[PDB]
CSV table of C-alpha atoms and ligand atoms in Angstrom, one decimal:
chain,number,residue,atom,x,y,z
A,1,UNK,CA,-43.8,51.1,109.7
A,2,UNK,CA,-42.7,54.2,108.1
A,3,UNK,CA,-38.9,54.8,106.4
A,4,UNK,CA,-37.7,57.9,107.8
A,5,UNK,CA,-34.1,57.6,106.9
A,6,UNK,CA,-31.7,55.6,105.0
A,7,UNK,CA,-27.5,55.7,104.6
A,8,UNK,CA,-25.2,54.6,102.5
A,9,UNK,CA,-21.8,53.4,103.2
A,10,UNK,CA,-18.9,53.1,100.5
A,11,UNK,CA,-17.2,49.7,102.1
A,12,UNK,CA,-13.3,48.8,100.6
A,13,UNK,CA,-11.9,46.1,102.3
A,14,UNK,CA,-8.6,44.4,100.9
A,15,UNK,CA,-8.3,40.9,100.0
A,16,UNK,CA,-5.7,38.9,101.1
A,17,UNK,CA,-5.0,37.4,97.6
A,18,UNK,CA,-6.4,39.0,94.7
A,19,UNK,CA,-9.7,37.4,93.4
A,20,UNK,CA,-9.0,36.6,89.5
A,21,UNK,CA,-11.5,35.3,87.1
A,22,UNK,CA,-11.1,34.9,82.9
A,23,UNK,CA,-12.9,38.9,83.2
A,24,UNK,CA,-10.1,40.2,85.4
A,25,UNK,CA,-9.2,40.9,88.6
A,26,UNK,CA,-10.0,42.8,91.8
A,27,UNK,CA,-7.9,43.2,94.5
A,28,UNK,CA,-10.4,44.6,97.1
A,29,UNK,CA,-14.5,44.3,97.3
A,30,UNK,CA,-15.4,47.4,96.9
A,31,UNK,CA,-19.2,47.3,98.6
A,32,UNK,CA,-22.1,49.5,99.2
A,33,UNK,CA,-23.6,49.1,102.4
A,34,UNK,CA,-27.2,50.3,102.9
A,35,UNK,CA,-29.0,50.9,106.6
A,36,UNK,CA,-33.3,51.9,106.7
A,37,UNK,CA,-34.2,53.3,109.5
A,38,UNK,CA,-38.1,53.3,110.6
A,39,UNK,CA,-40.4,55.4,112.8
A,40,UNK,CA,-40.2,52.5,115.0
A,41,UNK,CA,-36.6,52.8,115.5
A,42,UNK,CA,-35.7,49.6,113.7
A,43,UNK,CA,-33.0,49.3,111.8
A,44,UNK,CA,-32.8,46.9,108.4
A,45,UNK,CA,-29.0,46.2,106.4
A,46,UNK,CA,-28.8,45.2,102.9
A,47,UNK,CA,-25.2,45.2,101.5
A,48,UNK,CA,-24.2,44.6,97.4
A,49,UNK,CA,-20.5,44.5,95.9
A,50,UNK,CA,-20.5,45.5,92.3
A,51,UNK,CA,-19.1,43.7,89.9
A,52,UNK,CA,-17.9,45.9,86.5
A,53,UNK,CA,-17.4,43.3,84.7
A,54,UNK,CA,-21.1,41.7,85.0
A,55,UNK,CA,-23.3,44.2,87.2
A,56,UNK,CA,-22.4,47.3,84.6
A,57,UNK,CA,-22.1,48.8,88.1
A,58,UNK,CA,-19.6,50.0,90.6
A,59,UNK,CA,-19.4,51.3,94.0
A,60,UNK,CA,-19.3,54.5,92.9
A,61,UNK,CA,-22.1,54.2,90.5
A,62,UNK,CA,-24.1,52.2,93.1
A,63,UNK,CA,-23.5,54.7,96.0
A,64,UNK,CA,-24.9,57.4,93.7
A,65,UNK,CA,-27.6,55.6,92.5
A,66,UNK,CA,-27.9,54.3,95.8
A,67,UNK,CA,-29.4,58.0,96.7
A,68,UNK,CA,-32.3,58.4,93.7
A,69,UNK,CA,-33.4,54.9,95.3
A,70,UNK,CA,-33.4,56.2,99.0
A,71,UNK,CA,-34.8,59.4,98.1
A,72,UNK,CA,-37.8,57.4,96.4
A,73,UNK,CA,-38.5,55.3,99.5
A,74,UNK,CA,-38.6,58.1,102.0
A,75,UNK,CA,-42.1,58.1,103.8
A,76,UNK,CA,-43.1,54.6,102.4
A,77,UNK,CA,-44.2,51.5,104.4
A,78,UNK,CA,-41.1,49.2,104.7
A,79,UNK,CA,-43.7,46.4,104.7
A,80,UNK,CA,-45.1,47.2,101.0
A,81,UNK,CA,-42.0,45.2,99.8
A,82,UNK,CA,-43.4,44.3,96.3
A,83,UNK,CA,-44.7,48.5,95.9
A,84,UNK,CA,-41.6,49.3,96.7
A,85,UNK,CA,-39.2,47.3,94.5
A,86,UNK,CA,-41.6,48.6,91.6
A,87,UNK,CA,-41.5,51.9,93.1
A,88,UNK,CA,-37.3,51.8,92.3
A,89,UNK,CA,-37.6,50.4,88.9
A,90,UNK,CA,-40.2,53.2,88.1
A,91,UNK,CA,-37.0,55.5,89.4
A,92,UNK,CA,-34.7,53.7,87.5
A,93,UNK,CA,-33.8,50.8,85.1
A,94,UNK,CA,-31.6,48.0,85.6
A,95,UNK,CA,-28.9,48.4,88.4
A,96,UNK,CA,-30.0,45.4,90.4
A,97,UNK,CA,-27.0,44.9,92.4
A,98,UNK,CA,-28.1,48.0,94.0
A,99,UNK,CA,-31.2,47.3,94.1
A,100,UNK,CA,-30.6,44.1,96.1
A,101,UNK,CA,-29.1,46.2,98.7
A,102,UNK,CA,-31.9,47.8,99.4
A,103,UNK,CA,-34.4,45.2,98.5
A,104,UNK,CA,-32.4,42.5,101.1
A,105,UNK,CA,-32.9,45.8,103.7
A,106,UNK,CA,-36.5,45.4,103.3
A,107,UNK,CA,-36.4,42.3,104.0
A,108,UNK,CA,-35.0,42.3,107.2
A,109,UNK,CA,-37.0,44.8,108.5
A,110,UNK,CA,-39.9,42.6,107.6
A,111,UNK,CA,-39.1,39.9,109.2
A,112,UNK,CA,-38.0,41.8,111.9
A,113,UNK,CA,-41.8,43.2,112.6
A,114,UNK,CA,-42.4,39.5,112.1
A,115,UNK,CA,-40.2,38.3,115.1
A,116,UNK,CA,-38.6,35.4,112.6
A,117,UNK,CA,-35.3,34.7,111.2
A,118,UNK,CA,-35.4,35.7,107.2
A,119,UNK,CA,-35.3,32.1,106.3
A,120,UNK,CA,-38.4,31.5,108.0
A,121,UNK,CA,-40.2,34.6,107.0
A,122,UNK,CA,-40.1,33.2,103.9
A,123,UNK,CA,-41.4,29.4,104.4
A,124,UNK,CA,-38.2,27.8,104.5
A,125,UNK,CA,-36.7,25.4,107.0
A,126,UNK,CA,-33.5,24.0,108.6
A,127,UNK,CA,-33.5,20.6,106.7
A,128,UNK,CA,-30.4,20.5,104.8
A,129,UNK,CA,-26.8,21.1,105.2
A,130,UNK,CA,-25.2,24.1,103.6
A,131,UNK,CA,-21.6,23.0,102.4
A,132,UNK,CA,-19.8,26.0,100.4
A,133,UNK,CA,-16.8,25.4,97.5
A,134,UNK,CA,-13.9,27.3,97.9
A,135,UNK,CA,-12.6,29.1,94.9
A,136,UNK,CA,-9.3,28.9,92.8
A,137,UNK,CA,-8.4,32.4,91.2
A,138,UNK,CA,-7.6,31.7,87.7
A,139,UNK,CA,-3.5,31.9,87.2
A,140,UNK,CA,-0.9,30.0,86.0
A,141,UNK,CA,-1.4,25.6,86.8
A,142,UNK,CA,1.5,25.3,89.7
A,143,UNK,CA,-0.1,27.9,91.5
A,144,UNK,CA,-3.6,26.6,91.3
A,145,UNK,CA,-2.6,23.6,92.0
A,146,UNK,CA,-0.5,24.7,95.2
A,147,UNK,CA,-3.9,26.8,96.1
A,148,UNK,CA,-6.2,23.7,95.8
A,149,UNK,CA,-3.9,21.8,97.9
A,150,UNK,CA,-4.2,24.3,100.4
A,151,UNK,CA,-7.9,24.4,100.0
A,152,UNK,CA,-8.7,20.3,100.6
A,153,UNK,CA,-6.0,21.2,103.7
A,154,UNK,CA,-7.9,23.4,104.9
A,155,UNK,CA,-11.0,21.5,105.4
A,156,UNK,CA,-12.9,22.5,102.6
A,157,UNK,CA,-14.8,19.5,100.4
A,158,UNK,CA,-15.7,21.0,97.1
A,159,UNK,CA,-13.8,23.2,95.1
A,160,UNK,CA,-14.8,25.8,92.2
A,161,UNK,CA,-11.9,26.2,89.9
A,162,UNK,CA,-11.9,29.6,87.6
A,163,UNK,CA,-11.7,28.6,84.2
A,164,UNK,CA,-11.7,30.7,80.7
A,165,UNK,CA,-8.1,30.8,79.3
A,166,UNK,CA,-7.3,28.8,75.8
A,167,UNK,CA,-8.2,25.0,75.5
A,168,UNK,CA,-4.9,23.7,75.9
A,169,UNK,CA,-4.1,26.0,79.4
A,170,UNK,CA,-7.9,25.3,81.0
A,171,UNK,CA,-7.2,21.3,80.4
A,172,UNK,CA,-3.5,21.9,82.0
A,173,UNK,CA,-5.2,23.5,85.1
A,174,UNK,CA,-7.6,21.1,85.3
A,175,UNK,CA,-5.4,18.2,85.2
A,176,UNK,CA,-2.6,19.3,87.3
A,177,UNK,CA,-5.1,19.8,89.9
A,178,UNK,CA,-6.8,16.6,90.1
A,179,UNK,CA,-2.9,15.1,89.8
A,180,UNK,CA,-2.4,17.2,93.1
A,181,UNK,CA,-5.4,17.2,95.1
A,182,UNK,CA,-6.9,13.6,94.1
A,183,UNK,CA,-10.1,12.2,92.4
A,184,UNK,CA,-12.3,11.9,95.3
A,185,UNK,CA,-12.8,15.7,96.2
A,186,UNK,CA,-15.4,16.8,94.2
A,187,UNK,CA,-14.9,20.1,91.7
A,188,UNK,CA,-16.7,22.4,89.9
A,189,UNK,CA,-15.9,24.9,86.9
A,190,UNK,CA,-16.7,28.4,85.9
A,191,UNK,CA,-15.5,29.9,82.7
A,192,UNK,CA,-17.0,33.6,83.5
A,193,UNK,CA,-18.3,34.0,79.4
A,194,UNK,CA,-14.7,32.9,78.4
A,195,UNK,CA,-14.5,30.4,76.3
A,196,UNK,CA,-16.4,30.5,72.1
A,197,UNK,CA,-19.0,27.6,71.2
A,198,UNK,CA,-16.2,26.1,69.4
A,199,UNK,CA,-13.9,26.4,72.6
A,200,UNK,CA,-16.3,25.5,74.9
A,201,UNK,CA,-17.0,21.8,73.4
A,202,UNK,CA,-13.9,20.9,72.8
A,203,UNK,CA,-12.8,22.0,76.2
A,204,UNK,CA,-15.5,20.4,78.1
A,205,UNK,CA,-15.3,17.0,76.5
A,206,UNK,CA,-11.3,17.1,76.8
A,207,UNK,CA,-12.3,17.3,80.9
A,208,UNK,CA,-14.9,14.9,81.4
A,209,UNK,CA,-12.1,12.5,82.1
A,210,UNK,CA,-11.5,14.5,85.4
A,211,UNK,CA,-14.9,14.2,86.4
A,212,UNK,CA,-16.0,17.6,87.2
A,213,UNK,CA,-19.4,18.5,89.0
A,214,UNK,CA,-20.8,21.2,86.4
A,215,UNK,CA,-19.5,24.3,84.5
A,216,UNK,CA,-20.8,27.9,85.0
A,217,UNK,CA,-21.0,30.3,82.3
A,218,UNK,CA,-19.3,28.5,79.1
A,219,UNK,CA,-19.6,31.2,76.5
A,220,UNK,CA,-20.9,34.8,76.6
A,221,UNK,CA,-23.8,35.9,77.6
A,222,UNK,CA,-24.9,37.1,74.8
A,223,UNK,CA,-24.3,34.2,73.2
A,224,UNK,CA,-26.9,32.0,75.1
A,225,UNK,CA,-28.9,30.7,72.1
A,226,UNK,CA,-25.7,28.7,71.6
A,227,UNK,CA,-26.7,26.9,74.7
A,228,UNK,CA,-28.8,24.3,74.2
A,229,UNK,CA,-25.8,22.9,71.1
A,230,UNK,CA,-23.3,22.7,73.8
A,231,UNK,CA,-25.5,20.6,76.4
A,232,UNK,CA,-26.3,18.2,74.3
A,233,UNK,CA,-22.2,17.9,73.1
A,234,UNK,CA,-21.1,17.5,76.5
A,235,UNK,CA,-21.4,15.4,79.3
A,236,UNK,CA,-20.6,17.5,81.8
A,237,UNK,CA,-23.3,20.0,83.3
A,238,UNK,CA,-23.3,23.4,82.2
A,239,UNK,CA,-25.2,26.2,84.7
A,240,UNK,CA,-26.0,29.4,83.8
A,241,UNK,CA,-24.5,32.2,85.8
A,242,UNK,CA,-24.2,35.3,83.5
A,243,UNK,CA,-26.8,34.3,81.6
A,244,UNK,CA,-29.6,33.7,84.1
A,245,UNK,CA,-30.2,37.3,85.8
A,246,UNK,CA,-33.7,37.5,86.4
A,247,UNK,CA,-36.8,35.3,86.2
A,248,UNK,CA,-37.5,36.6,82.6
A,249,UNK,CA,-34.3,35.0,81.6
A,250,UNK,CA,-35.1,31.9,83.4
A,251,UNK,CA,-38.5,31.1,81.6
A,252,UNK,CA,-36.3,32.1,78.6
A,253,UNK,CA,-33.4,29.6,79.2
A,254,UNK,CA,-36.2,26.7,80.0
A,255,UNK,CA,-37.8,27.1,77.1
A,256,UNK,CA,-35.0,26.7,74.6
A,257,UNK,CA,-33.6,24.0,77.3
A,258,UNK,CA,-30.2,25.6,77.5
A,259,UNK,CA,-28.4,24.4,80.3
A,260,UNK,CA,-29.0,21.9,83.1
A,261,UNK,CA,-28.5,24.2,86.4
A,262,UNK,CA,-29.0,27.9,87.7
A,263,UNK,CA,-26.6,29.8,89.3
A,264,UNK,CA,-28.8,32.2,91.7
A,265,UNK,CA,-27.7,35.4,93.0
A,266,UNK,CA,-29.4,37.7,94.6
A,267,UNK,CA,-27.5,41.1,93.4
A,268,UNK,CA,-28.5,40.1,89.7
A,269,UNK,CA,-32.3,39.5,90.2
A,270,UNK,CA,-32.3,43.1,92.2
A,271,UNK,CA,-32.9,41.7,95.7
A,272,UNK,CA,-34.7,38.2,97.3
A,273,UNK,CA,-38.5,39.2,95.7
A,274,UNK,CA,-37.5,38.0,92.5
A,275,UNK,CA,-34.9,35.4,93.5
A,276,UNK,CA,-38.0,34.1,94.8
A,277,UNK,CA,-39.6,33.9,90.9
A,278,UNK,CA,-36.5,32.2,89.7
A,279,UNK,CA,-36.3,29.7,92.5
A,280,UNK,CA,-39.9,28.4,91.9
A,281,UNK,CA,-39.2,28.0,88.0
A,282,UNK,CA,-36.8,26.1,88.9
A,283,UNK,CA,-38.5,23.8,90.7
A,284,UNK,CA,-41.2,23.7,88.1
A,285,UNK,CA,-38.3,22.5,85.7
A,286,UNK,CA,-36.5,20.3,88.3
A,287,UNK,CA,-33.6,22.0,87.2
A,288,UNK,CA,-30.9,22.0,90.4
A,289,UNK,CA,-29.7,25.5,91.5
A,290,UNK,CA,-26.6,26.8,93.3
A,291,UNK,CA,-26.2,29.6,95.6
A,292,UNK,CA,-23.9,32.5,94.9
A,293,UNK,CA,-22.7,35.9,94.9
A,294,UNK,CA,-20.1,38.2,94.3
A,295,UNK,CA,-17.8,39.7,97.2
A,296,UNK,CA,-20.6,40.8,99.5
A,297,UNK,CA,-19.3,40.3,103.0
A,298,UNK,CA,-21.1,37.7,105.7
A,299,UNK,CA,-23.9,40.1,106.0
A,300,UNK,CA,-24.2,40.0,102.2
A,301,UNK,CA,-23.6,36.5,102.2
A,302,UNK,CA,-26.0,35.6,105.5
A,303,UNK,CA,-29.0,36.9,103.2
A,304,UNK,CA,-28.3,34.6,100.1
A,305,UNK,CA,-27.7,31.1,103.4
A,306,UNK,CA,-31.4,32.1,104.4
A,307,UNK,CA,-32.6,32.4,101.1
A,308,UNK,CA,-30.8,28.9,99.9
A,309,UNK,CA,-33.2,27.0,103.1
A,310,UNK,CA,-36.1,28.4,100.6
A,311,UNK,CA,-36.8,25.2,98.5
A,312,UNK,CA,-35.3,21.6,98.4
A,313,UNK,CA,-34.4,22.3,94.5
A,314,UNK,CA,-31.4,24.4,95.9
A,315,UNK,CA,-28.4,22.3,96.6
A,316,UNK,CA,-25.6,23.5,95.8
A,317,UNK,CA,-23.2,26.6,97.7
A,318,UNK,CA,-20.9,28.8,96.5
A,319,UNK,CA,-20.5,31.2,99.8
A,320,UNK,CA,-16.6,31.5,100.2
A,321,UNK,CA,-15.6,35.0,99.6
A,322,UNK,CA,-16.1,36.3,102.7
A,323,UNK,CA,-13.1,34.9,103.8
A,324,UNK,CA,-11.2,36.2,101.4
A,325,UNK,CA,-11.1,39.4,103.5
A,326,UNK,CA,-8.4,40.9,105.1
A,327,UNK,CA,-10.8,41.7,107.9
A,328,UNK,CA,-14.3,40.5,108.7
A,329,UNK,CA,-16.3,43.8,109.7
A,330,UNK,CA,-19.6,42.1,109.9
A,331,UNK,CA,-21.4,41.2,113.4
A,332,UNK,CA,-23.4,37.9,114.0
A,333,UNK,CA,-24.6,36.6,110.0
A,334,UNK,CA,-23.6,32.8,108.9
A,335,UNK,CA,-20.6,31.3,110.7
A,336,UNK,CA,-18.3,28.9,108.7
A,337,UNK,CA,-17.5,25.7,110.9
A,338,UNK,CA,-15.3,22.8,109.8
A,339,UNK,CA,-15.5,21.2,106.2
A,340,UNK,CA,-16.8,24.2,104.9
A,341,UNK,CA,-20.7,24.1,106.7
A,342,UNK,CA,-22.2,27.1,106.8
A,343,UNK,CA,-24.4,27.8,110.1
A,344,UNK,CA,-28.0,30.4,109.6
A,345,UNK,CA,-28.8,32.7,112.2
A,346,UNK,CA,-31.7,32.4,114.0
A,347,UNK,CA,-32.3,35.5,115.8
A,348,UNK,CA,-35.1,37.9,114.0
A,349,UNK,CA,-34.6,39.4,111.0
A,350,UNK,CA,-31.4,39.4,108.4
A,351,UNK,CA,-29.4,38.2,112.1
A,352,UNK,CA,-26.4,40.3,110.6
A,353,UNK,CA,-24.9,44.2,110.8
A,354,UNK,CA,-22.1,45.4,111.6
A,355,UNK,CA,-19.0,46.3,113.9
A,356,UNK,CA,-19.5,48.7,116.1
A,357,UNK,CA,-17.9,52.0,114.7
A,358,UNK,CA,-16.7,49.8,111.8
A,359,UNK,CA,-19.7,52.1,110.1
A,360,UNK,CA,-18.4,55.6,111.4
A,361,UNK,CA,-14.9,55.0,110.1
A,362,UNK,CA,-16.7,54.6,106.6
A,363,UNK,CA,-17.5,57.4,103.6
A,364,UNK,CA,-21.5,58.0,104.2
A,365,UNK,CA,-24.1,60.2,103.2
A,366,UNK,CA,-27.9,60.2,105.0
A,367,UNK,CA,-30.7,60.1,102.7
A,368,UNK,CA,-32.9,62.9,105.2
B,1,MG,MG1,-20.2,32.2,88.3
């Protein structure tokens, strides 16, 4: 089936509570959404939310570049997924986050002329639950403690807790935490590049007491080398977020055994094709790997839940942004039920897009 058309959406929506991390803080995902149409009338959606701080992109850059890519894929066989992901980085390189959009888009499509569900499309199965964290914005300790109280009251059974700040203040958040929420709800850590080696171990052994599941992203990214030191040092986990991108950097990271989990996300490995690579070195290297993202909505979101049914070596879940929104655009994609379960779509294709006339409201333009 040929591309005849694609558009591109600039998507601001407004969080409820601003999303803060040790990098900074955003008070809206500002996303790119991106619609291929086909001779055959059908239509795929891919979505990406830019990051600054991590993707080097923005909405604005991605909506630009967003049209070189388009451009390239006019008149080419939505099926000739692997051509066409080389035929973008021939166009350009790096800016996977956009990339994913239109990779994800692909995708759907695909299994769309299929007649299967994404997850299926690409040999997984329904044999697992899907449980995602919740996050705690990284602020002063009352008020995370007060948010991760509202959190296990809410349902929700594991929560990631934003790290990053100075050794004494991380250990304060931590502790005052685990004093208000209790020892038997299981947490996780991400640091978001923001701690030095030095930091880092001292940090992580002054928190083993709290028991904590695993920590993302210790120390820069460009400090990775330092990786392997700090595992061995520290009890706890450490999983590679920043640092693990593409499935070049996951051979890389496995060789020099730097850290004990992946954190895989679909904008950073420029769409599901390669997420694919990274998934099956992981399970080469029984190395455990959690499901993320950035502040893609449920459509965004519903792409990574089919990829995470993949492989048995994924296990752990980090979908909660979506409902972070002010309000949920998207129609059909994953529904969240009680204790934080996430339910996949079964209907062909992605099984997402959007509101009707949510799309007309926003800024476009129409690649042909
Ligand atoms: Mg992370």
């Amino acid at each position: 089936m040929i591309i005849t058309q694609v558009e591109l959406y600039k998507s601001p929506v407004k969080l409820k509570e601003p999303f803060k991390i040790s990098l900074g803080i955003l008070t809206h995902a500002n996303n790119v959404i991106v619609r291929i149409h086909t001779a055959s009338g059908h239509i795929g959606y891919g979505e990406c939310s830019p990051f600054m701080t991590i993707h080097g992109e923005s909405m604005d850059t991605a909506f630009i570049v967003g049209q070189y890519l388009a451009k390239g894929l006019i008149g080419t066989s939505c099926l000739d997924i692997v051509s066409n992901s080389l035929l973008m980085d021939a166009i350009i390189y790096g800016n996977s986050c956009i990339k994913s959009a239109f990779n994800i888009a692909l995708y759907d499509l695909a299994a769309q002329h299929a007649g299967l569900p994404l997850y299926a499309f690409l040999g997984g199965k329904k044999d697992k639950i899907i449980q995602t964290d919740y996050t705690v914005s990284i602020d002063e300790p009352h008020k995370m403690a007060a948010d991760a109280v509202q959190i296990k009251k809410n349902g929700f059974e594991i929560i990631k807790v934003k790290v990053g700040g100075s050794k004494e203040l991380d250990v304060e958040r931590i502790r005052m935490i685990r004093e208000a929420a209790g020892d038997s709800i299981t947490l996780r850590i991400d640091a978001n590049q923001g701690w030095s080696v030095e930091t880092a171990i001292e940090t992580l052994t002054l928190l083993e007491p709290y028991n904590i599941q695993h920590c993302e992203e210790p120390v820069s990214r460009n400090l990775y080398t330092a990786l392997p030191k700090i595992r061995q040092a520290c009890r706890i986990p450490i999983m590679a977020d920043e640092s693990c991108c593409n499935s070049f950097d996951a051979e890389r990271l496995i060789q020099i055994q730097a850290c004990d989990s992946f954190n895989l996300k679909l904008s950073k490995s420029a769409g599901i094709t390669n997420a694919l690579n990274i998934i099956r070195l992981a399970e080469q290297a029984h190395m455990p790997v959690q499901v993320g993202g950035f502040l893609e909505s449920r459509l965004g979101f519903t792409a990574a839940a089919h990829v995470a049914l993949v492989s048995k070596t994924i296990c752990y879940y980090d979908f909660d942004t979506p409902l972070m929104f002010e309000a949920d655009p998207v129609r059909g994609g994953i529904v969240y039920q009680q204790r934080g379960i996430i339910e996949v779509p079964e209907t062909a294709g992605l099984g997402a897009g959007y509101q009707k006339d949510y799309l007309s409201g926003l800024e476009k333009i129409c690649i042909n």
